Design goal:
Layout: H1 5-20, H2 25-40, H3 48-52, H4 59-70, H5 75-82, H6 84-92, H7 100-107, H8 114-119, H9 126-133, H10 135-139, E1 142-143, H11 144-161, E2 166-169, E3 179-180, E4 183-189, H12 200-212, E5 216-222, E6 227-231, E7 245-253, H13 257-264, H14 268-280, E8 285-286, E9 289-290, H15 308-314
Parallel strand pairs: 4-7
Antiparallel strand pairs: 1-3, 2-4, 5-6, 6-7, 8-9
The chain binds sodium ion (NA) (2 copies).
The structure holds a DNA duplex.
Organism: Homo sapiens
Protein name: DNA polymerase beta
Subunit structure: Monomer. Binds single-stranded DNA (ssDNA). Interacts with APEX1, LIG1, LIG3, FEN1, PCNA and XRCC1. Interacts with HUWE1/ARF-BP1, STUB1/CHIP and USP47. Interacts with FAM168A.
Length: about 325
DNA sequence: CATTAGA
DNA sequence: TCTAATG
């Protein structure tokens, strides 16, 4: 957790490099398994050799470790930290819509900057257009103050359109959290579940609503069960307009909401820990259901849920207010 | 680990 | 269709 601090960090920088700049899924995949294990290691690594005895630690990394342990740095790490090319890809990538592949391509055309981007806005697709457009706001955190307002909006429509809707703003927001990255709306409706052959309109219907009123301002992607867009709060009595905010609405078959919802609300740790428990308690949890574990090895059969409670019960835990779904 | 775009 | 990107 700290005794292995730098080692793990160098390792991740490294891993990251292969992954992004180079197309080195393997090397990259190496660095991380390595960073995973040294992290677990209970002791202060004193040398490559020592490290080396570990699984995943080949000679390649050991070597790296000594140098860093030796001198407060690593050259390669230094060389890469310097390089404009690689530097360039690390940057472009921030653009929502821009991945590594695209990053490299742009770079090799000479697109390195933001401006560069604008000059060749033509070479960009919609998503990437909007990513570039809202570059600034997309980087900014959402205050809970704002969150509440937004939420309030979405909840109001959803209902106005159909009363039978059920929306849940998941995430950290849902976990109390003072700020949030974007907003997630868990959507479900009774007339939609596991089997009931869809109702795409069920999604569409509301998307449309949000837009009609101008909450939704852009679409990154709209498909039958997953919308990806941009939204924004009505800039009051002027002098202050709102930043454009990332947003994701998604249709869920009523018979899987609470799992979905439990799940999405995290925290990543709570899940696992919650997940790990259902296992002893003879279960199996995942993004959509909970199933009784059968001796033979495995076993199925989707236990029925009407609240985040039911699920708890099943595994006989204490209902944890999301506030405390912290870990 | 899945759903959407894209070309 | 593959492949890329976000979640
Ligand atoms: Na080894
Ligand atoms: Na990006």
């Amino acid at each position: 957790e700290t005794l292995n601090g730098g080692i793990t960090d160098m390792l991740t920088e490294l891993a990251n490099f292969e992954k992004n700049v180079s197309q080195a899924i393997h090397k990259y995949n190496a660095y991380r398994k390595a960073a995973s294990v040294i992290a677990k290691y209970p002791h202060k690594i004193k040398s490559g050799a020592e490290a080396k005895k570990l699984p995943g630690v080949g000679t390649k990394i050991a070597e790296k470790i000594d140098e860093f342990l030796a001198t407060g740095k690593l050259r390669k790490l230094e060389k890469i930290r310097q390089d404009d090319t690689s530097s360039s890809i690390n940057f472009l990538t921030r653009v929502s819509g821009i991945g590594p592949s695209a990053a490299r391509k742009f770079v090799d055309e000479g697109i390195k900057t933001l401006e560069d981007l604008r000059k060749n806005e033509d070479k960009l697709n919609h998503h990437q257009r909007i990513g570039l457009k809202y570059f600034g706001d997309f980087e900014k955190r959402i205050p809970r103050e704002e969150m509440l307002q937004m939420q309030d909006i979405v909840l109001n429509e959803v209902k106005k359109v159909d009363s039978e809707y059920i929306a849940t703003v998941c995430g950290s927001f849902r976990r109390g959290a003072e700020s949030s990255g974007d907003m997630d709306v868990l959507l479900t409706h009774p007339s939609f579940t596991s089997e009931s052959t869809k109702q795409p309109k069920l999604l569409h219907q509301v998307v449309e609503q949000l837009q009609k009123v101008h909450f939704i301002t852009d679409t990154l992607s709209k498909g039958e069960t997953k919308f990806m867009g941009v939204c924004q709060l009505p800039s009051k009595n002027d002098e202050k307009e709102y930043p454009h905010r990332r947003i994701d609405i998604r249709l869920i078959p009523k018979d899987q909401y609470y799992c979905g919802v439990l799940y999405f609300t995290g925290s990543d740790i709570f899940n696992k820990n919650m997940r790990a428990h259902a296992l002893e308690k003879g279960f199996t949890i995942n993004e959509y259901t909970i199933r009784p574990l059968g001796v033979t090895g495995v076993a199925g059969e989707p236990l029925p849920v009407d609240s985040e409670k039911d699920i708890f019960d099943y595994i006989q835990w204490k209902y944890r207010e999301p506030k405390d779904r912290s870990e």
